[PDB]
Design an enzyme around this catalytic site. Structure first.
Site, PDB file in Angstrom:
ATOM      1  N   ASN A 116      33.519 -44.683  22.661  1.00 47.66           N
ATOM      2  CA  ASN A 116      34.630 -45.524  22.238  1.00 47.66           C
ATOM      3  C   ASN A 116      35.588 -44.745  21.355  1.00 47.66           C
ATOM      4  O   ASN A 116      35.162 -43.883  20.581  1.00 47.66           O
ATOM      5  CB  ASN A 116      34.132 -46.742  21.474  1.00 47.66           C
ATOM      6  CG  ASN A 116      33.926 -46.455  20.007  1.00 47.66           C
ATOM      7  OD1 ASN A 116      34.859 -46.534  19.235  1.00 47.66           O
ATOM      8  ND2 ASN A 116      32.721 -46.080  19.625  1.00 47.66           N
ATOM      9  N   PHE A 120      39.689 -48.697  14.702  1.00 55.26           N
ATOM     10  CA  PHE A 120      39.677 -49.715  13.654  1.00 55.26           C
ATOM     11  C   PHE A 120      40.625 -50.865  13.996  1.00 55.26           C
ATOM     12  O   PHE A 120      41.454 -51.273  13.187  1.00 55.26           O
ATOM     13  CB  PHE A 120      40.031 -49.140  12.272  1.00 55.26           C
ATOM     14  CG  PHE A 120      38.886 -48.443  11.557  1.00 55.26           C
ATOM     15  CD1 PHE A 120      37.572 -48.623  11.942  1.00 55.26           C
ATOM     16  CD2 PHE A 120      39.149 -47.621  10.478  1.00 55.26           C
ATOM     17  CE1 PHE A 120      36.560 -47.979  11.314  1.00 55.26           C
ATOM     18  CE2 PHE A 120      38.132 -46.968   9.821  1.00 55.26           C
ATOM     19  CZ  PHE A 120      36.834 -47.125  10.247  1.00 55.26           C
ATOM     20  N   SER A 187      33.591 -43.151  10.782  1.00 47.87           N
ATOM     21  CA  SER A 187      34.203 -43.346  12.091  1.00 47.87           C
ATOM     22  C   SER A 187      34.773 -42.019  12.581  1.00 47.87           C
ATOM     23  O   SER A 187      35.452 -41.325  11.817  1.00 47.87           O
ATOM     24  CB  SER A 187      35.317 -44.383  12.051  1.00 47.87           C
ATOM     25  OG  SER A 187      35.900 -44.482  13.349  1.00 47.87           O
ATOM     26  N   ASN A 189      37.130 -41.840  14.806  1.00 47.39           N
ATOM     27  CA  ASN A 189      38.360 -42.205  15.514  1.00 47.39           C
ATOM     28  C   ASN A 189      39.514 -42.535  14.571  1.00 47.39           C
ATOM     29  O   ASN A 189      40.548 -43.042  15.022  1.00 47.39           O
ATOM     30  CB  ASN A 189      38.105 -43.395  16.450  1.00 47.39           C
ATOM     31  CG  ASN A 189      37.054 -43.102  17.490  1.00 47.39           C
ATOM     32  OD1 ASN A 189      37.062 -42.046  18.081  1.00 47.39           O
ATOM     33  ND2 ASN A 189      36.159 -44.042  17.727  1.00 47.39           N
ATOM     34  N   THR A 190      39.346 -42.313  13.274  1.00 49.83           N
ATOM     35  CA  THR A 190      40.453 -42.348  12.323  1.00 49.83           C
ATOM     36  C   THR A 190      40.627 -40.940  11.775  1.00 49.83           C
ATOM     37  O   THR A 190      39.729 -40.435  11.071  1.00 49.83           O
ATOM     38  CB  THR A 190      40.185 -43.351  11.206  1.00 49.83           C
ATOM     39  OG1 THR A 190      40.048 -44.657  11.781  1.00 49.83           O
ATOM     40  CG2 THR A 190      41.329 -43.348  10.209  1.00 49.83           C
ATOM     41  N   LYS A 235      27.890 -45.816   5.173  1.00 53.22           N
ATOM     42  CA  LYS A 235      27.543 -45.487   6.550  1.00 53.22           C
ATOM     43  C   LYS A 235      27.938 -44.046   6.817  1.00 53.22           C
ATOM     44  O   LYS A 235      29.100 -43.676   6.613  1.00 53.22           O
ATOM     45  CB  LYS A 235      28.264 -46.401   7.539  1.00 53.22           C
ATOM     46  CG  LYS A 235      27.736 -46.264   8.924  1.00 53.22           C
ATOM     47  CD  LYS A 235      27.965 -47.455   9.806  1.00 53.22           C
ATOM     48  CE  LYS A 235      27.564 -47.156  11.254  1.00 53.22           C
ATOM     49  NZ  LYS A 235      27.731 -48.350  12.095  1.00 53.22           N
ATOM     50  N   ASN A 264      26.370 -43.524  12.294  1.00 52.57           N
ATOM     51  CA  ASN A 264      27.475 -43.918  13.161  1.00 52.57           C
ATOM     52  C   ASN A 264      27.359 -43.153  14.486  1.00 52.57           C
ATOM     53  O   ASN A 264      26.363 -42.484  14.788  1.00 52.57           O
ATOM     54  CB  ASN A 264      28.816 -43.631  12.465  1.00 52.57           C
ATOM     55  CG  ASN A 264      29.912 -44.625  12.790  1.00 52.57           C
ATOM     56  OD1 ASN A 264      30.151 -44.946  13.933  1.00 52.57           O
ATOM     57  ND2 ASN A 264      30.599 -45.112  11.755  1.00 52.57           N
TER      58      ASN A 264
HETATM   59  C1  LIG Z   1      32.832 -50.237  20.636  1.00 47.71           C
HETATM   60  C2  LIG Z   1      32.189 -49.878  19.336  1.00 47.71           C
HETATM   61  C3  LIG Z   1      32.854 -50.182  18.141  1.00 47.71           C
HETATM   62  C4  LIG Z   1      32.294 -49.801  16.917  1.00 47.71           C
HETATM   63  N1  LIG Z   1      32.969 -50.098  15.744  1.00 47.71           N
HETATM   64  C5  LIG Z   1      32.362 -49.773  14.537  1.00 47.71           C
HETATM   65  C6  LIG Z   1      33.013 -50.072  13.353  1.00 47.71           C
HETATM   66  O1  LIG Z   1      34.075 -50.676  13.374  1.00 47.71           O
HETATM   67  N2  LIG Z   1      32.443 -49.724  12.150  1.00 47.71           N
HETATM   68  C7  LIG Z   1      31.225 -49.077  12.102  1.00 47.71           C
HETATM   69  O2  LIG Z   1      30.734 -48.783  10.999  1.00 47.71           O
HETATM   70  N3  LIG Z   1      30.580 -48.735  13.289  1.00 47.71           N
HETATM   71  C8  LIG Z   1      31.136 -49.093  14.497  1.00 47.71           C
HETATM   72  N4  LIG Z   1      30.476 -48.804  15.676  1.00 47.71           N
HETATM   73  C9  LIG Z   1      29.173 -48.071  15.659  1.00 47.71           C
HETATM   74  C10 LIG Z   1      27.981 -49.001  15.714  1.00 47.71           C
HETATM   75  O3  LIG Z   1      28.019 -49.873  14.599  1.00 47.71           O
HETATM   76  C11 LIG Z   1      26.677 -48.238  15.728  1.00 47.71           C
HETATM   77  O4  LIG Z   1      26.533 -47.517  14.524  1.00 47.71           O
HETATM   78  C12 LIG Z   1      26.581 -47.228  16.873  1.00 47.71           C
HETATM   79  O5  LIG Z   1      27.103 -47.797  18.044  1.00 47.71           O
HETATM   80  C13 LIG Z   1      25.155 -46.743  17.069  1.00 47.71           C
HETATM   81  O6  LIG Z   1      24.313 -47.822  17.371  1.00 47.71           O
HETATM   82  P1  LIG Z   1      23.756 -48.016  18.871  1.00 47.71           P
HETATM   83  O7  LIG Z   1      23.365 -46.694  19.430  1.00 47.71           O
HETATM   84  O8  LIG Z   1      22.552 -48.914  18.769  1.00 47.71           O
HETATM   85  O9  LIG Z   1      24.842 -48.627  19.691  1.00 47.71           O
HETATM   86  C14 LIG Z   1      31.053 -49.152  16.880  1.00 47.71           C
HETATM   87  C15 LIG Z   1      30.398 -48.864  18.069  1.00 47.71           C
HETATM   88  C16 LIG Z   1      30.952 -49.226  19.300  1.00 47.71           C
HETATM   89  C17 LIG Z   1      30.197 -48.847  20.540  1.00 47.71           C
HETATM   90  O1  LIG Z   2      32.827 -46.622  12.649  1.00 46.22           O
HETATM   91  C1  LIG Z   2      33.302 -46.597  13.766  1.00 46.22           C
HETATM   92  C2  LIG Z   2      34.608 -47.110  14.149  1.00 46.22           C
HETATM   93  C3  LIG Z   2      34.998 -47.024  15.430  1.00 46.22           C
HETATM   94  C4  LIG Z   2      36.380 -47.485  15.906  1.00 46.22           C
HETATM   95  O2  LIG Z   2      36.882 -48.521  15.419  1.00 46.22           O
HETATM   96  O3  LIG Z   2      36.858 -46.677  16.710  1.00 46.22           O
HETATM   97  N1  LIG Z   2      34.198 -46.428  16.374  1.00 46.22           N
HETATM   98  C5  LIG Z   2      32.962 -45.911  16.117  1.00 46.22           C
HETATM   99  O4  LIG Z   2      32.240 -45.406  16.936  1.00 46.22           O
HETATM  100  N2  LIG Z   2      32.560 -46.047  14.807  1.00 46.22           N
END
Ligand SMILES: Cc1cc2nc3c(=O)[nH]c(=O)nc-3n(C[C@H](O)[C@H](O)[C@H](O)COP(=O)(O)O)c2cc1C
Ligand SMILES: O=c1cc(C(O)O)[nH]c(=O)[nH]1
Ligand SMILES: Cc1c(C(=O)NC2CC2)nn(C)c1Cc1ccc(C(F)(F)F)nc1
Length: 372
Positions: A116, A120, A187, A189-190, A235, A264
């Site tokens: 992804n 944000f 993140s 992506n910022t 995080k 993350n």
């Molecule tokens: C589409 C998407 C959006 C995410 N947005 C955030 C976010 O806004 N803030 C954050 O701390 N992590 C974000 N994450 C990361 C997840 O919270 C998580 O840490 C990561 O996907 C690893 O967990 P998993 O392998 O079980 O999916 C995002 C992940 C995905 C896939």
């Molecule tokens: O903490 C984050 C945030 C994003 C996002 O908003 O793009 N994506 C991630 O994979 N982790």
């Protein structure tokens, strides 16, 4: 039988979605179902031997939903009623953002992976606070939700120069309705966000956040679950070297952070053909071992003094037990909801209970850090 999250039609629809429908659209559909309270639910009580805690946060069970799933807090009740003990909404920023251009989310079903570059996207602190206030009002009138925990992940707007200003803004608006605050410095992506993981910057960020939370009282209370001021988590990104991880650990010990979310998304997963040359961070099963090793490393660098929320590649009860034995007190799911669907909580809870019984553990707390 129909509201049971393990109803057969949900797996039929899940497979169809994973085969023919864009990732973000599937996500938006899930949120739409929850917005109208037509998702399945599992109000069964959980094993008293699988409950866990981080300081005064008492989790009825060890599984929550990671940040980025309900970015705007529009779906808290329905997601929690799937069987989760807590959810982390956000990440939110002071001003709203639509994020990077679409498509920005891609799945690889064979490997149970996601990539992804959202950027944000969220309605902004003020709107999301209003959504969370509505949930807290509902919670005050519903006993089945009174022990559920809601955390808020905060970050900065893309164009903001000093992150501390944006963190302070969010704390002063949403902090009194949060059970804990997660500082998102990880993140991918910022632009430049991850640089805030450098020790001296991170230290000042943590103290600034804690000082702002501690001032909420004077500035005039706690409309949350704990009825206490929110704890502060950080995080972290798994793409760090050993010297950076040690420097972060030393800062977490000096600043008395209440916990660390490990971890993350990553940029170290590059053997997924369909993801090649794409922007963003990878989640899912391929992240499990990377992020579990990261838990072990930080559990030892912080001398076991900092509680750990595990995030990354958790799909089964065995996966969760591995995180717990590595040092985690609680687990967060995201990709498991994408590839297993409605049954994620019910199924993983049962599996973990079976494993605790098999491995000779009296309770889950006894297993925390036992690998070490
Ligand atoms: C589409 C998407 C959006 C995410 N947005 C955030 C976010 O806004 N803030 C954050 O701390 N992590 C974000 N994450 C990361 C997840 O919270 C998580 O840490 C990561 O996907 C690893 O967990 P998993 O392998 O079980 O999916 C995002 C992940 C995905 C896939
Ligand atoms: O903490 C984050 C945030 C994003 C996002 O908003 O793009 N994506 C991630 O994979 N982790
Ligand atoms: C896939 C998927 C997704 C998804 O791809 N997210 C983006 C890749 C990151 N997110 N979630 C909750 C699911 C499961 C789901 C969605 C919709 C339905 C249905 F019942 F409405 F059909 N069932 C299960």
């Amino acid at each position: 039988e129909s509201y049971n999250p393990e109803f057969f039609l949900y797996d039929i629809f899940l497979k169809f979605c994973l085969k023919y429908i864009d990732g973000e659209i599937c996500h938006d559909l899930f949120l739409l179902l929850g917005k109208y309270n037509i998702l399945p639910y599992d109000t069964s009580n959980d094993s008293i031997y699988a409950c866990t805690n981080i300081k005064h946060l008492d989790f009825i069970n060890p599984f929550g939903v990671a940040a980025g799933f309900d970015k705007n807090g529009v779906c808290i009740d329905s997601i929690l009623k799937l069987g989760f003990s807590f959810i982390e909404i956000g990440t939110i920023t002071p001003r709203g953002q639509t994020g990077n251009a679409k498509p920005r989310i891609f799945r690889d079903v064979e490997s149970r992976s996601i990539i992804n570059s959202c950027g944000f996207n969220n309605m902004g602190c003020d709107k999301v606070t209003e959504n969370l206030i509505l949930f807290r009002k509902r919670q005050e009138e519903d006993k089945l939700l009174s022990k559920h925990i809601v955390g808020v992940s905060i970050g900065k707007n893309k164009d903001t120069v000093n992150i501390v200003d944006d963190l302070k803004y969010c704390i002063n608006k949403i902090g009194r309705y949060a059970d804990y605050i997660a500082i998102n410095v990880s993140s991918p992506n910022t632009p430049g966000l991850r640089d805030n993981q450098e020790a001296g910057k991170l230290k000042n960020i943590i103290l600034s956040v804690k000082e702002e939370i501690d001032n909420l009282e004077k500035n005039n209370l706690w409309f949350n679950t704990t009825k206490k001021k929110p704890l502060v988590f950080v995080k972290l990104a798994p793409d760090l070297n050993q010297e950076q991880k040690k420097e972060i650990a030393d800062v977490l010990l000096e600043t008395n952070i209440d916990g660390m979310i490990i971890s993350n998304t990553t940029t170290q997963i590059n053997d997924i053909k369909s993801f090649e040359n794409k922007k963003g961070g990878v989640s899912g099963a391929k992240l499990k071992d990377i992020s579990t090793k990261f838990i072990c490393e930080m559990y030892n660098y912080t001398n076991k003094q900092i509680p750990i929320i595990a995030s990354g590649g958790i799909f089964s009860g065995l996966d969760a037990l591995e995180k717990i034995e590595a040092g985690a007190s609680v687990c967060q799911l995201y990709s498991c909801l994408v590839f297993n669907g409605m049954k994620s909580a019910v199924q993983i809870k049962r599996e973990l209970n079976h494993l605790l019984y098999q491995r000779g553990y009296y309770n889950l707390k006894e297993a925390i850090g036992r690998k070490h």
